[PDB]
């Protein structure tokens, strides 16, 4: 019971950390897709 | 009345930069015709505008200046074609680069010709043996077929192509002219020392004799790199249209797209998705549709293409990757994960396909590998689903036991293309369960021992399987006998 | 009228007329060519110059070349003498069997049926495919769409439907190949013949074919669907028959347009597409429809660029369908064919009032469990399975077996699966799933359920596997 | 010929000529300036106008200013008298030691050696660096590339290699500083002097230095590579010499190109780069090569922007190398130096028929175990090792010991490792890795393997750790 407690403390703390990282990775990606998709439109439009 | 420079058959460079000449005059040029520059430099008429002709230059534009005279040629771009090219290394226009003398060409061919239609072809039915079990058993390639080799840098894509070219000596050194396969290897964007390395190995394998190498390398002008594939294709159609058989490797179609993109942007054509021209699909479809199988009414010849595409971060869903996967008759996907893991070729069973199926396989092979592909797919799944031995039954323990053994057999080294009957012998051993009790680690060693035995002692069974092309009931019985007994002595 | 070519840039050709400017959509023929080159007028640039899209290669054209206004949009031979034949974008036979002697000719451009011409009958169209039938039933006269990225099964699925449905169908069929593989039109033509759907000796042909493959210039690709669809509208209206329309692949019509778009001088919309994508798709998709006069049962293959279902094209097409079969490389990758995604496929007839509650409760029953299992997948992945409630490790079981029972060996893919093709009847399907869901096979092994037709084969296969 | 400055935008100067328009690539000298201002012609815009790229700051120029056609492309002093000297893009000395008095002058724009001129001899170049030697061995006369995001180890690795290889090389060396730090040029020059590879007293210098750093206008950074390159080509072909060519950083040449590209008026390609990116890398990379006349072993540092190896610049460079050393921030952050990614570095020499199967099998052995460890990592990450199989935990132990044994102290990085630099001989590397693989050290602790040379030192460290 003391080892399951310890193991589950860690697991839970790793999870949260993973959560915090994926979230930040998500926003970076979200911002780059918009920027990326918009530069693509501008390039096409300017070439005309 | 000097009338040599009228503006109907000649023009004068209005401006030149980055390989694009804006020629004035050239009133009678045709779209896509070749023109000549004072400097002996050839170019191609791509944009025919109201007031100018946009000319793409096949070479260093440093020798071109405003004012230069440009002359029509009256000819739409073409190139030398025919048997004279075999064993020679040419540039994207046909000129030799092996400094081994002029090509003795008597025929020419337009680099850009539409692919034969519906009526002139017949279903792909004759195998095109690579020499690679994994490929010849799971993603079979038939003649007239287009099969893509795709994967990240260094996952082994070229190797598949070399082994294939090398495996063709078997038939080329033979008698039968229908089984022969002339090869064409187009390098694009590659590096000269790599190609030089490449043609060396081919020479050392005594394969140059039946190979032509069209080279359009890293320093060649964008338009040469761009053309290179069409050039090489045309040299392959010569064989295709004359009841002969050709095999062309486009290595790779990624660097060509870049070349196209560059040439195209410099012509001021608005960039599209990912910066490429809105017609990059078209750029490759047009080319690969040309690989084809003609009916007996047209010689029964064929052209088989093996285009290469480089993915990034093993992402096959990528726009270009899928653009090309949607043109060819299948793909061979190589993963770096598998490669590092020891699985070489790094063929990814699940993601590779052959749209020709077993129709491109000998009955011997169909017999042994008929259901193996979906078996290995289903194996990879459960192998994952039990990366925790979840109270697993037998049907799945058996599934994992075959899966692993079969995976080891599909492994293979380089430069040693196997003969069809050799593949059938070894797959046979696995697929039949005779190896389900051998230790995975043993399998590779066993295959070298076993194959040794049958090749040396039993060439009667090999020559029959090879000849009948099938596995008769007695051959199948002579084989069961050999494997089981040799296996036992082997596990002493 | 006679115009001259003033500029050539790829598939786009600008023409200058001195007197009489051909209207938009008009087809013009280039003079001086070994082969017939048609230019469709696309725009009026002004200054009596029209911008056009070439219906074929532009090589060898010259500035100043002559061009005659044909006085009308591309018109093709329409009628019963098109059956058993192979046509071009521009209506020319391409099968080497001589002219197509039709009484009439039709322009490929036409307005879509009015709102008061619509029909609302909804009859299930059984196909023999477990997945489709169970979960996303096709409807007679309805619009069907097969969505899929490169190489996931769109065409094979279209191939088995031609076999399980087109073949018995008493009415015509029109198969329009739009921007697909030439090898494929040759495989199908010769298959139609070997099975008598196409008859080269008599008038028993029950299928007309139209082709504008991947080896064609954007222009041809932007129109074959129109030609194909036009042939089909004739049998719908002028004969009043029950038509079966197969298009593979309609995405090609939209990619065709995006390929010339920039040369038409347009600012790109998102993802590179042309700004008129939806309307371009709308005026077309709206003709592919059943009316009170006749019935069309269209099966359209829809390519999904980069495998992204949100891509403006695949994305814009969902609204035009009554039933959708979404294929997935993630499913295919596991060896489950047909690779239909059970949770992303839908049908407008999946209504208790239309298929019945037994049909409906099973379908939804199967979907709940696959969803339930999807959610757990990522979690037992890491945390393993021990902690799971026997209640929950049974749904993992049943789900994995259903996942398999949904695969099926097609009769057009024996070259692929190494298995004889099975066609399962609607009741054999409903029942098979009903029992798996009922716990009636929790004893057989999953593998017994993989690549089989009816549930009895799963039971037999268990024994065969029993050793 | 005399032209006139018509327009000025940053480094893009447009000059009009009345009689005699200079060909593309020709160098023009602007008239009326305190120092030399060379303009390299880039294209003929028509109307007797030429668009050019300045080789130095353009402030002060005035429309209508006179420009003179030099009649040729930038030409620079080439020969042995450049040895031990520091020079400019335009070849002028910048070491305050007088004129470089050479017999010949070479133009920085040349064509690449022809196909028939290529070589295919493949000899391994041992460097004394464990990871490099074992897994992605370099090769004499080959092309090596060190990929690295900011501050990961590219320069330190070039320095250590200069130390371990250049120092005992019979033959010349050329260091070309492209777009990097000036202090570094200074750090190196003086260091070279000190170890005597640069001798300001005799003619015994074995190194020629060319620099166009981070402070120059784009055009200078866009051409110094060509300049260092030319110097090297002289020793190769005119003296059949075995050269060593170090460049820090070749990514800067491409970046420089992207800086002027809009000014040249080009529609940009992906990520804002110039549509001519690949061809520009190509006609330049293709002169950096060994031939039948001479050998060029070249080591090029390749800066990876935002750490993205999918960036057009680095992405397009892989195809030009024979061996690549991909550095990783993730590894560096673990404290492993050099921060080389073992599953991402490669070498066309990693062939059994070249390094021997012993080498070939340890090499693939190490990668396989690290690849295996790599897949377990996802689960190790939430749940740690507990739930791992006894077998799986042994790969993990071995993988973590192999990972540590791949690190090593460089003389050049002594001030930071706190340890004395080590040079390990190939056979010592093949061996030490065999044993680890073979389970001959499953008893030692990981920490024993961190920061050491030969395995023998790893055993010792273990005793000291007690």
Swiss-Prot record, chain A:
Query: May I ask which residue range the UniProt record assigns to the signal sequence?
Result: none
Q: Tell me the domain of life.
A: Eukaryota
Indicate where the modification N6-succinyllysine is found in the sequence: 21
**Where's it found, cell-wise?**
Mitochondrion inner membrane
Q: State the function annotated in the UniProt record.
A: Subunit gamma, of the mitochondrial membrane ATP synthase complex (F(1)F(0) ATP synthase or Complex V) that produces ATP from ADP in the presence of a proton gradient across the membrane which is generated by electron transport complexes of the respiratory chain. ATP synthase complex consist of a soluble F(1) head domain - the catalytic core - and a membrane F(1) domain - the membrane proton channel. These two domains are linked by a central stalk rotating inside the F(1) region and a stationary peripheral stalk.
Assembly and partners are described as: Component of the ATP synthase complex composed at least of ATP5F1A/subunit alpha, ATP5F1B/subunit beta, ATP5MC1/subunit c (homooctomer), MT-ATP6/subunit a, MT-ATP8/subunit 8, ATP5ME/subunit e, ATP5MF/subunit f, ATP5MG/subunit g, ATP5MK/subunit k, ATP5MJ/subunit j, ATP5F1C/subunit gamma, ATP5F1D/subunit delta, ATP5F1E/subunit epsilon, ATP5PF/subunit F6, ATP5PB/subunit b, ATP5PD/subunit d, ATP5PO/subunit OSCP.
The similarity annotation says: Belongs to the ATPase gamma chain family.
Descriptive protein name = ATP synthase F(1) complex subunit gamma, mitochondrial
**Source organism of this protein record:** Bos taurus
Q: Which gene encodes it?
A: ATP5F1C
From Swiss-Prot, chain B:
Q: Which residues carry this modification: N6-succinyllysine?
A: 100, 106, 169, 178, 200, 244, 366, 437, 445, 470, 478
Protein origin, superkingdom: Eukaryota
User: Cellular component GO terms, alphabetically?
Assistant: mitochondrial inner membrane; mitochondrion; plasma membrane; proton-transporting ATP synthase complex
* Annotated positions of the Phosphothreonine modification: 73
Task: Tell me if Ribosomal protein is a UniProt keyword of this record.
Answer: no
Q: What does this protein do?
A: Subunit alpha, of the mitochondrial membrane ATP synthase complex (F(1)F(0) ATP synthase or Complex V) that produces ATP from ADP in the presence of a proton gradient across the membrane which is generated by electron transport complexes of the respiratory chain. ATP synthase complex consist of a soluble F(1) head domain - the catalytic core - and a membrane F(1) domain - the membrane proton channel. These two domains are linked by a central stalk rotating inside the F(1) region and a stationary peripheral stalk.
User: What is the protein name for this chain?
Assistant: ATP synthase F(1) complex subunit alpha, mitochondrial
Query: Its gene?
Result: ATP5F1A
From Swiss-Prot, chain C:
UniProt entry tagged with the keyword Acetylation: yes
The entry's Mg(2+) 2-binding residues are: 180
* PROSITE patterns hit by this protein: ATPASE_ALPHA_BETA
- InterPro entries recorded for this chain? AAA+_ATPase (IPR003593), ATP-synt_VA_C (IPR055190), ATP_synth_F1_bsu (IPR005722), ATPase_a/bsu_AS (IPR020003), ATPase_alpha/beta_chains (IPR050053), ATPase_F1/V1/A1_a/bsu_N (IPR004100), ATPase_F1/V1/A1_a/bsu_N_sf (IPR036121), ATPase_F1/V1/A1_a/bsu_nucl-bd (IPR000194)
Tell me the residues on which N6-succinyllysine occurs: 66, 103, 201, 206, 464
Respond yes or no to whether keyword Transmembrane is given for this record: no
Q: Which residues carry this modification: Phosphoserine?
A: 357, 375
GO MF annotations, alphabetized: ATP binding; ATP hydrolysis activity; proton-transporting ATP synthase activity, rotational mechanism
Q: Which GO terms describe its biological process?
A: proton motive force-driven ATP synthesis; proton motive force-driven mitochondrial ATP synthesis
Q: Kindly list the positions annotated as binding phosphate.
A: 151-155
Keywords noted in UniProt: Acetylation, ATP synthesis, ATP-binding, CF(1), Glycoprotein, Hydrogen ion transport, Ion transport, Magnesium, Membrane, Metal-binding, Mitochondrion, Mitochondrion inner membrane, Nucleotide-binding, Phosphoprotein, Transit peptide, Translocase, Transport
Binding-site residues, ATP: 151, 153-156, 181
Locations listed in the record: Mitochondrion inner membrane
GO annotation, cellular component aspect: mitochondrial inner membrane; mitochondrion; proton-transporting ATP synthase complex
Carbohydrate attachment residues:
48
Q: Which residues carry this modification: N6-acetyllysine?
A: 66, 103, 140, 201, 206, 368, 422, 427, 464
- Kindly state the subunit structure of this protein: Homotrimer. Component of the ATP synthase complex composed at least of ATP5F1A/subunit alpha, ATP5F1B/subunit beta, ATP5MC1/subunit c (homooctomer), MT-ATP6/subunit a, MT-ATP8/subunit 8, ATP5ME/subunit e, ATP5MF/subunit f, ATP5MG/subunit g, ATP5MK/subunit k, ATP5MJ/subunit j, ATP5F1C/subunit gamma, ATP5F1D/subunit delta, ATP5F1E/subunit epsilon, ATP5PF/subunit F6, ATP5PB/subunit b, ATP5PD/subunit d, ATP5PO/subunit OSCP.
Instruction: Write down the HAMAP family for this protein, in alphabetical order.
Output: ATP_synth_beta_bact (MF_01347)
**Which protein is depicted?**
ATP synthase F(1) complex catalytic subunit beta, mitochondrial
Q: Which organism is it from?
A: Bos taurus (Bovine)
